[PDB]
Amino acid sequence: ITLKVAIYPYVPDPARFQAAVLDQWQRQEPGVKLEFTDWDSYSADPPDDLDVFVLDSIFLSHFVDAGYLLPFGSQDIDQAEDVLPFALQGAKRNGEVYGLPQILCTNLLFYRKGDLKIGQVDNIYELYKKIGTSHSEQIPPPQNKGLLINMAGGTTKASMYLEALIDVTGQYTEYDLLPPLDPLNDKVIRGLRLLINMAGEKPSQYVPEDGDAYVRASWFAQGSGRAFIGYSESMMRMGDYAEQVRFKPISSSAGQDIPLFYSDVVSVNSKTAHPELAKKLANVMASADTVEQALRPQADGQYPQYLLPARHQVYEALMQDYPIYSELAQIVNKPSNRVFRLGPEVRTWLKDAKQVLPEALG
Numbered sequence: 001i002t003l004k005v006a007i008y009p010y011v012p013d014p015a016r017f018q019a020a021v022l023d024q025w026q027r028q029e030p031g032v033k034l035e036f037t038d039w040d041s042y043s044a045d046p047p048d049d050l051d052v053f054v055l056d057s058i059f060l061s062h063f064v065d066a067g068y069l070l071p072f073g074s075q076d077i078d079q080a081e082d083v084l085p086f087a088l089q090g091a092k093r094n095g096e097v098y099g100l101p102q103i104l105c106t107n108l109l110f111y112r113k114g115d116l117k118i119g120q121v122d123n124i125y126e127l128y129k130k131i132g133t134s135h136s137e138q139i140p141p142p143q144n145k146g147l148l149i150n151m152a153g154g155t156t157k158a159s160m161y162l163e164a165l166i167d168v169t170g171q172y173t174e175y176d177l178l179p180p181l182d183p184l185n186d187k188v189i190r191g192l193r194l195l196i197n198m199a200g201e202k203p204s205q206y207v208p209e210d211g212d213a214y215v216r217a218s219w220f221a222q223g224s225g226r227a228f229i230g231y232s233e234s235m236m237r238m239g240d241y242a243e244q245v246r247f248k249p250i251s252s253s254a255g256q257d258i259p260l261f262y263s264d265v266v267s268v269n270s271k272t273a274h275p276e277l278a279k280k281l282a283n284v285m286a287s288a289d290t291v292e293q294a295l296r297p298q299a300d301g302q303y304p305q306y307l308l309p310a311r312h313q314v315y316e317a318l319m320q321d322y323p324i325y326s327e328l329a330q331i332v333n334k335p336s337n338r339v340f341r342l343g344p345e346v347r348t349w350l351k352d353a354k355q356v357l358p359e360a361l362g
Helices: 014-028 057-065 085-090 124-131 154-169 186-199 201-205 215-222 234-243 275-286 288-295 312-318 324-332 346-353 357-361
Strands: 002-006 033-036 052-056 100-105 107-112 143-149 225-231 245-248 260-269
Touching (some): 002 275, 014 033, 052 275, 085 100, 143 201, 154 186, 154 357
Antiparallel strands (some): 052 260
């Protein structure tokens, strides 16, 4: 038996995950071969022959309603009690768990050690009062000046829009019904513009020729910018500098805050010829052992991926050697945290959004 598996491609080091998964799989199922495939939920639906795969939960509702996924009964979930409650909950649809939470993600406010003033910033408007408007379009921003933030790509912007809208309304929603693109929410748009205003248009829209999703973190480590809003994983690219940065969650609104996290869950194809073996693999891929191994440096010169695990056990195990994970654990354990979910019509809404959001933002 050979199982076709696809790990989440948007991580600092995908190979560490593949290796982690293969090693952990072989320990309990050495006779079942794994064929790692490149599959992206952001630009593709599950192929009929892809047995197990990790997808971004914004696409969960669509995959489920389309009949692509195989649900996990409470019997098919290993150590559900160690999984973060909000993560496990964000993986449910139609009263069923449809994915095993493997990675959680959120932008964080990164600032430099001795910059106490940015340390007290809790939202983007408070951030603006400190750093103000960018006064240069150069890439990257001048040393210790402005905001570094990746706002390139239509889906990223669309995603930031939808997350901001939740905090603006003060009510969490899985967006079963996606919002109208006309009229756009002005507060949300003002929020996104404020960010662009702080970062600079070109710098915020920059996409490196090498497709490096973490280039702004390296710029930050080099001294560019005063503040940096990026994913926790950004710290791997910071290398030795990750210990010198300080970070903290940052809200897009001053009044209401519902911390939203992208959740990459391991799901099983409904068409898989090996349901139990596939469920077994999904569990291994989401196991505390596998995720810890994937995040930990696997060779000389490597740093932790600094990705956010969905299980307590990984934070418990990592923080001894990597104290940064103590702070990350704290953020992920906030009771108000929620998984960022989008309705079944996400793909269409995303296409529609890029025809209106870039104009609204300038």
